[PDB]
Every structure is written in structure tokens, then in C-alpha cells.
Design a protein around this ligand. Structure first.
Ligand code: NA
Length: 129
């Protein structure tokens, strides 16, 4: 599924991501824009042979099981495929764990480089929330 911007904002809010660990909803919509372009089915092989999965490009290195990332953990206790669902619940659950792991949204390198310190509220402008 390819969400609209305000649609994804509403889905993140319904799933309690809005101001989770102090990150405004525009921070999470911005991260999703640049990780996946709002595509739940997005997958990207990392050079290290791990894969990133879904709207928030959650990495098989630590967070989900794809069966092909030697020496990885599955700290969200989910198959990485669950992170490609048109329902974002499992992605939101796992992103709550990632953002609590100590480095906030810096865990998303695209957030750090493209959203951090920017006017992220623009990502939820005009959204009926
Ligand atoms: Na893994």
C-alpha cells in the first residue's frame, strides 16, 4: 500500500506514534517519506546483507527475522514480512522499540540527514487529525 501523507499521519496517530518518546507526528511522516516514500512494501538490501522492510525501513540486522541475515537478532519478535502489511500496526510496534533503544530517531539515518531540525510540522499541514 502507498499511503497519502495525511492518511499515514492518521494511521500513525491511531497507533499512538504521535509524540511517542517526544517525537511529533511530522517527525514520523517525514521519516516514512524518505525511508519508503510511504510504500508499505518497500525493501532495500544493505551492503552488510541485512534488509530494511516497510514504511520505516526496519532492519533485519536487529529487529525482524528474514532468515537470511547471519548473526542478526529479531528484537521485535516478528517476521520482516509482517513489516510489509498494508496495516502498519506491526511496523509502529517495532518502531516504538527502535526509538526507545537510546538514540531516538537517529536510528533512522534518513531522519537524521533529511528530517532532523527541519520544519517537520509541514508533513502534517492541512491534515484533519
Ligand atoms: Na534478524
Amino acid at each position: 500500500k502507498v499511503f497519502g501523507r495525511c492518511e499515514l499521519a492518521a494511521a500513525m496517530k491511531r497507533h499512538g506514534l504521535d509524540n511517542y518518546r517526544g517525537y511529533s507526528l511530522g517527525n514520523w511522516v517525514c521519516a516514512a517519506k524518505f525511508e519508503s516514500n510511504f510504500n508499505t512494501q518497500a525493501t532495500n538490501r544493505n551492503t552488510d546483507g541485512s534488509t530494511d522492510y516497510g514504511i520505516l525501513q526496519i532492519n533485519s540486522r536487529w529487529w525482524c527475522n528474514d532468515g537470511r541475515t547471519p548473526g542478526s537478532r529479531n528484537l521485535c519478535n516478528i517476521p520482516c514480512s509482517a513489516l510489509l502489511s498494508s496495516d502498519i500496526t506491526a511496523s509502529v510496534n517495532c518502531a516504538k522499540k527502535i526509538v526507545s533503544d537510546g538514540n531516538g530517531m537517529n536510528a533512522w539515518v534518513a531522519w537524521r540527514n533529511r528530517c532532523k531540525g527541519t520544519d517537520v510540522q509541514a508533513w502534517i499541514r492541512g491534515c484533519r487529525l
